[PDB]
Amino acid sequence: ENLKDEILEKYIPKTKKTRSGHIVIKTEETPNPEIVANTRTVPGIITARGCAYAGCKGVVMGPIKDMVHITHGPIGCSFYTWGGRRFKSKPENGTGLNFNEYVFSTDMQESDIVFGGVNKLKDAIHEAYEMFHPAAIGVYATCPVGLIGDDILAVAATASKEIGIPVHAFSCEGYKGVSQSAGHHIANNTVMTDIIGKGNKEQKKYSINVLGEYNIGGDAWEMDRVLEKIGYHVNATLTGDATYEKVQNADKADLNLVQCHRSINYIAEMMETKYGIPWIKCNFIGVDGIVETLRDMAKCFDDPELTKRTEEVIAEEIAAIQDDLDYFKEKLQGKTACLYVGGSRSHTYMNMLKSFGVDSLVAGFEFAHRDDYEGREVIPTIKIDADSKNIPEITVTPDEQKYRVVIPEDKVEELKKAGVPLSSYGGMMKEMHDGTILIDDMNHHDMEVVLEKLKPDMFFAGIKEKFVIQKGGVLSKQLHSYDYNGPYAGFRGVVNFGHELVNGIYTPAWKMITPPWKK
Amino acid sequence: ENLKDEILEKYIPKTKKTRSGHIVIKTEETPNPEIVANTRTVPGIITARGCAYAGCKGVVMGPIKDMVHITHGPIGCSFYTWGGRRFKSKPENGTGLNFNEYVFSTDMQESDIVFGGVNKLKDAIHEAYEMFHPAAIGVYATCPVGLIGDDILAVAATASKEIGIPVHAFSCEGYKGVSQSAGHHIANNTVMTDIIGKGNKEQKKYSINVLGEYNIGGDAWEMDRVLEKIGYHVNATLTGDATYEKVQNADKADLNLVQCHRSINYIAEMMETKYGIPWIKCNFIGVDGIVETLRDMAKCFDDPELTKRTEEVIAEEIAAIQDDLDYFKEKLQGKTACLYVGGSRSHTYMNMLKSFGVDSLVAGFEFAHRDDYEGREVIPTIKIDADSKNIPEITVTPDEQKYRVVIPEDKVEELKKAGVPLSSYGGMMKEMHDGTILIDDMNHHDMEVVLEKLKPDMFFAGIKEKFVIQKGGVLSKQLHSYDYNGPYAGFRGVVNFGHELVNGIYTPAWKMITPPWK
Amino acid sequence: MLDATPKEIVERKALRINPAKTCQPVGAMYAALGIHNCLPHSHGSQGCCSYHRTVLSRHFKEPAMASTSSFTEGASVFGGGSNIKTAVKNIFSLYNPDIIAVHTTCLSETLGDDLPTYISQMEDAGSIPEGKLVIHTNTPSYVGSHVTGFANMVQGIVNYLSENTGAKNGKINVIPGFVGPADMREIKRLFEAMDIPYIMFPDTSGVLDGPTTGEYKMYPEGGTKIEDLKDTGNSDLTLSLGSYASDLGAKTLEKKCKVPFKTLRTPIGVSATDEFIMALSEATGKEVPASIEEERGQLIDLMIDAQQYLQGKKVALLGDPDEIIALSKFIIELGAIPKYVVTGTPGMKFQKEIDAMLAEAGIEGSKVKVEGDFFDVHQWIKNEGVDLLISNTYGKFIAREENIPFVRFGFPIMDRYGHYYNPKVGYKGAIRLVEEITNVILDKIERECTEEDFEVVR
Amino acid sequence: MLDATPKEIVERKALRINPAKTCQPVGAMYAALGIHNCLPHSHGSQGCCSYHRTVLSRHFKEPAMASTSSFTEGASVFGGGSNIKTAVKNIFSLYNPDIIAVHTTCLSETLGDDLPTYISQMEDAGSIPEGKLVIHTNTPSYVGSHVTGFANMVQGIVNYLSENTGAKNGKINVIPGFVGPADMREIKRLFEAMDIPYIMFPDTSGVLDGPTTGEYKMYPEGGTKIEDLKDTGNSDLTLSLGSYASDLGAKTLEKKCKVPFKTLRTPIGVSATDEFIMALSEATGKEVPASIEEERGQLIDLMIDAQQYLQGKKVALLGDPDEIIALSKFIIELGAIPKYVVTGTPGMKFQKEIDAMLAEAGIEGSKVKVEGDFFDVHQWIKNEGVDLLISNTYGKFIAREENIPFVRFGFPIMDRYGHYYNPKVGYKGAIRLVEEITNVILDKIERECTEEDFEVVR
Ligand code: ICS
Ligand code: ICS
Ligand code: CLF
Ligand code: CLF
Ligand SMILES: [Fe+2]
Ligand SMILES: [Fe+2]
């Protein structure tokens, strides 16, 4: 009888059985249902998911702007990472290297498949070095690489010794894991052990990192503007607009801020274990999100001037935009929305929509794990799935030289009791209201049932869904690419996002679709 | 049995009889036939001619860049002078006024026709003064103005007192005369009496004016570049890129250079009479034209340094372009041309074409007079035509305070016998070779016969003829607008012209016109 | 550029600057070139004819033939009768049109020349050969604009030619207004797709947009044929597209020949094209075919796909009334704002229609002016800027000075090649307009953004 | 911008930078979308399918549907047979295409998956409903480019569907190559104007350029119907437009069904369109109609009218081989110079054809490169500049850095709206190209000239 049943009806029995667990309705009676997530994609279902190479090269590593990222594969893996994901970069200090406008690859041919690709890879690494003299070189595996016998780790190590700069190999072949997620994990492992803590910079006062933030459309620059006004030192952002050296010095901070939990929590955990650096979940999207984040940060530092400046900056930033905020609410209140993004933004955009008076009825992720849906408290119960079991796990230990107590245990417990999300993340479901539905790995079939039954005013998704939804007369704004706008994070981001959203809803052509020779 | 007969054949008898005189063939036997020119257009014949307002406002006066030119008429007379004629202007000294980008009108309506337009004209002059504070204002009559009773001379005189700057009226109603030519004459009269000699500037050494040069496509700037390099002071150019003040000080020169004879010879004559300033015919188009002009100037001044510098500059300018010149001749030699322009350029472009190896077979003018065709020596014989008899003639006399003998008579006679064209112009026909044809007021019918019979490689004309010629598979380059290029005058102009001409001839699509199924 | 134009406005009552119109006769000349085997004739001083032919060639990059009476000072006293009688003899003999379509100038109108008498005197004298025609209209340039001249020439066509002989032709007449030959082709294409027989007049397609074949043809293949012009009195209905250019002729045909008419907007954009298609369907009972529906749906798809770059954009528009009324409506349909809206052609309808569509959309603070000019619009822009400028070539000066994305539209467009092969009417023309508008907007964004803000996808 | 690109030219042997191609599968996906009621299926890891669908949506601003086998590490061990068998059961039940058109990836090709065996096993299992079809091609991404992928999918269509049943259909098959839906529409329009019956395949018109109607339609109205794809074996002749994209399919059809073929250039410009029209006339005895002749003559008119802005212009071109061969010829026909001419797609034909047309025109000093990239061309430009750049979206970075007038052409064009409604082929498409080229040249001239050099007419 309910929407879950309606979604499930058309599936053949095998598929119905496996998909049922990926769809849950939050209710007053059961506010915290368990979901199935991070399992294999059903073949033929029309998924939005990508691959582990996307998650590693295209997502986590690509934004490091003074590292040359070489895709070891045939050409498409490289071509399809040429600017489609909108991490913004500028030369550091006006003068540093920036390879954002380029893609690099070994352009594997049949000879490489038949005879091996390691000599071409070596030669490409040396050409990249001699041409560009970057801070580092990355080498990224693609589907054929392991299967044809290429040992990219060994190639990288040999080359690094010859050329005198770091060369980092990533075994992110696309079929590994079940989605982009495996690629995040693979990237995090090598960044943690081979990059982070290799630097030697002196730590500055009030130093924070923003973890899992990629400067899409300028988001990170907008965060940084506000943080620096309050008085923080933004030691590093992993990895939006990052230099290699900043990542090497990520350990020179007192607090890690986790924006995208899914992609970076591995590093957040490992930095806490190895260095003693605590982390808090942050959300710099939406006024309520930003305000709460800044207030949590001030509680952690407990510095009277930082606290004072925090409130001054919040008040001045809000005063500057309050007329816009009022307009968004006037124009949008009472409308309904669905959100379907990859691993974080379905959740982080919710508070902004709620402030605009928009009711989020449906949300899901392509590739998030149960902890992103249900909260990190469920981690001990997560079953290890066969299709991701071979993604390597690394363990770190307290560094006998660099480990330090940043926030004492008793103070951590006091801050948690006070609501500060130290080493925690409540997950998306907690924020959703009763009677809403969650759909993991939502496919085309599922989406069409949702559209028909719920008739939402807007459906946020990506490029593959956007035009499907709009052909049906419903607005779809992209939460990955931001429809080529931004920033959408931070205080100025709320204004950018809200005007774009109002402009979308009130576009006249929506009312002109039926020709006058028809009813 | 000749091309003239072939052109004449289709005309009805009355038209044939009148058109015959307008077409002549130069031969060895009779190298200087008399032509009929500067008579009325035959109604219905498809002329290229314009009107007196065009010649006055559009042509001679419009280029004065810091004068607000108000067309007193309905809107089109104004609109059709908005940028189509490519006199280039820049703020004088980087800072002066420039109205090139504007057109100004009284936008006459029904009530102005019924009751007269003088109230609106007065009000428009005051609005222009208050808004723009120009050096001067011009008021230009159009077709309805005389007929509706408006005394624009009186309105201008009243307004000039009330605003404190000069206001100049021009009775250039379009039906006056027979063509643009009457408008030149009307402009020259008022410029001579009311503008020239009203200034106060101290004359500089080696001062020349370029008369009848309008800076089309930057031509005047290119000739000034070379003249200034040699050492002349270019006191004024009438009227390309001119300021009002420079026209007012045109009398502060030792030598007038006449580029366009037809439009400016009135002022050349009157400046010689009133001030004693001699003039020579010049031609800054084509290497041979330019070289001869510069050498003639040097002979007039007879200054050893100027003579030396003239040769130095000539040699350097030629050295820089000789490879281009050689290329034009290689690519164009043996080809044939026709030239049909307004009153000067059919002649002034001939030496350049000849240097490229191009044979000019046909030439004519829309509105030139017998003296432009046959030379100024025929002036005493020109019959006064009924359709232009009312264009005003003015007479000047020597200014007792300002008149001076610049070149003594003995030296003048010496220079003339040496070939310097002091107060003379031999005309176009003299330059043409034997067995060529001249067509005055060439019409569509005439042009089509020429194209069919002679099959020229190229036909230079204007915008109305260009596409007619090119639809028939023959190149036509515009000698008025330069096809939106320039300069075409001066040494750099030869290069600009030649490359555009070669590019036109060798455009591949000329050979693609016939489809493969035909 | 345009350095002399002040920001501070002093209202002009007499001095016209940089006009958003030209005079009647070129509109009549254009209409006459829409008749097959017609030589337009300018009854006045020849300066008019030369200028008017010239602007047509500058716009279309084509020949544009016309004869003139070549008035002299004598004619300015005795009238132009002798001149036109001489002209007609030379025209038929030398140039052999099938029809001479005479218009007048401020000169002949001020003089009160009596064209009906001259023409009757020509006929009496035997100057009009068997099977040949001379028609006229009166086009005083101190009234209206070139649009009015077009309208008057269409009335002259009806006055002289249209006849109801009782032989119903089963056709709809369409008077397309003062639009280009590409627009005429698109309107004909739509009739043909609807399977509706028609007579379009004037029709300059195949006259001012013709091929090069290697032989100059004085009378191009196109133009409405004289026999079909006569047959317009036997039609079922006339559609008058654009009231300023077309209603006079439609109303004249109703009075003369009892052919009813319907006035429509020039079909630019969604509603105006829709209204045209609906009028066709309603008049004939014919269904709208899938091909036309597809085109409309592609336009809607494009409007939605490109929406983000259009919403709230402030637009300055100058041009002729019929086209600017319809374009203004399309601007609103796109989600943009007609901010400054001007025509140089007099008349109340523009004001009423523009004001009404702005009010319907809830748009306040726009400036709408009849008998405004390009100087007015520039001054307004100096006081509050815009995001887009749409006008004929003369807007390019404002666009450069003020750094405004610029779309060439209307007449004359004298500085680009091939524009005259592109319609602005219909769903197809609307698609082209949206592409052009969004292209110029995006070109500016991408030229001026910082390097770090440069984008692959838009 | 592109600050890391030095002037000093490097002849790289290993590192590919900023490629002038992408991989096979999207070409096969595009071809498959040119079959009515077809769901393309990507047999590999799902990253490929997502990326390939994505680029099509970014280019066309349209949906682009495809399913995937979603390989896991298990497949990388046991092969993808189980995955595709499961996929087909979900595809027919949920999405009900009439035909599934399978292509492969570097993963399944490296693994040696055996599609014919899997497909025969699905039939045996009863996984393919009555009346439904599953076809395949093999598209290793380490061979060729997306053009090769298109070619291979066309071959797969022939292999599975084409049949000579002895029932002659009187039609000509046309394989249009890797061209856009607008180009397919224009080629169809020309066949129809010639009155020549035909079967076009693939045909993405009405699939990747469709309307918004308010209902999402998974299988759009367009695409060649399965019954017509079968009937291609009964045709008189196949015209293969663009040898790289189209010859494999045409040759395969000749071998299977004894339908002869003729190879033609993609019909861009004068000679290449002329050669297409002549092939049609010669094959059928049908005369060329006046409408087509008029269009050609308008193109010639425009080439002559705009000539001054074209002669001697140096052009850099990058793209796919069939389109760039024909466009390079058109550049020569315009009087301009193909200065730098690059494709990322391998093969000697491009080099031979480009070199030969340069030699025929007497053009020395150009650089032509097969398997060159956008980094190469930028380096060349830094050593000797050009007047015009023609390429897909990725040329925009060079155009901005070097200040070169820029024409978007080929695939993918991801940054403008409505481009996919304009053909580049035929006389009509050639007219649009000349307008676009001259517009961008004139725009730069008028933005950069001094004020005193600014012009009304051009
Ligand atoms: S990294 Fe992840 S799919 Fe956290 S792979 Fe994906 S630039 Fe999404 S919801 Mo594209 S887990 Fe970032 C993401 Fe979120 S590429 Fe971006 S928008 S916040
Ligand atoms: S003034 Fe005359 S028609 Fe001497 S009215 Fe005309 S800018 Fe011509 S041949 Mo246009 S007598 Fe000048 C002329 Fe020559 S407008 Fe220019 S090109 S040299
Ligand atoms: S799932 Fe991911 S994107 Fe796919 S291949 Fe695999 S790592 Fe790469 Fe690159 S070249 Fe093309 S797109 Fe593929 S088929 Fe061979
Ligand atoms: S021959 Fe010359 S251009 Fe002609 S009118 Fe007379 S002065 Fe002028 Fe101005 S407004 Fe138009 S174009 Fe004439 S018809 Fe009345
Ligand atoms: Fe033309
Ligand atoms: Fe679309």
Residue numbers in the entry:
A (entry chain A): 3 to 521
B (entry chain C): 3 to 520
C (entry chain D), D (entry chain B): 1 to 458
Give verbatim lines from the article.
Biological nitrogen fixation is the process of reducing atmos­pheric dinitrogen to a biologically available form, such as ammonia, catalyzed by the enzyme nitrogenase found in certain bacteria and archaea. Nitrogenase is composed of two metalloprotein components, the molybdenum–iron (MoFe) protein and the iron (Fe) protein in the well characterized molybdenum nitrogenase system.
Cp1 and the ortholog from Azotobacter vinelandii (Av1) represent two distinct families of nitrogenases, differing primarily by a long insertion in the α-subunit and a deletion in the β-subunit of Cp1 relative to Av1. With the exceptions of the long insertion (residues 376–429 in Cp1) and deletion (residues 1–47 in Av1) in the α-subunit and β-subunit, respectively, the overall structures of the Cp1 and Av1 folds are similar and can be superimposed with a root-mean-square deviation (r.m.s.d.) of the main chain of 0.92 Å for 1554 aligned residues (78% of the Cp1 sequence). The long insert (residues 376–429) in the α-subunit of Cp1 adopts an irregularly structured loop involving residues 386–408 that is flanked by a short helix on each end. Our analysis confirms that the metal centers, the FeMo cofactor and the P cluster metallocluster, and the Fe16 mononuclear metal-binding site are essentially identical in Av1 and Cp1. Electron-density analysis and model fitting indicate that the P cluster in Cp1 corresponds to a mixture of the PN and POX conformations, as was also observed in the 1.0 Å resolution Av1 structure. The side chain of Serβ141 in Cp1 also shows two alternative conformations with the hydroxyl-group O atoms positioned 2.1 Å apart, correlated with the alternative conformations of Fe6 in the P cluster.
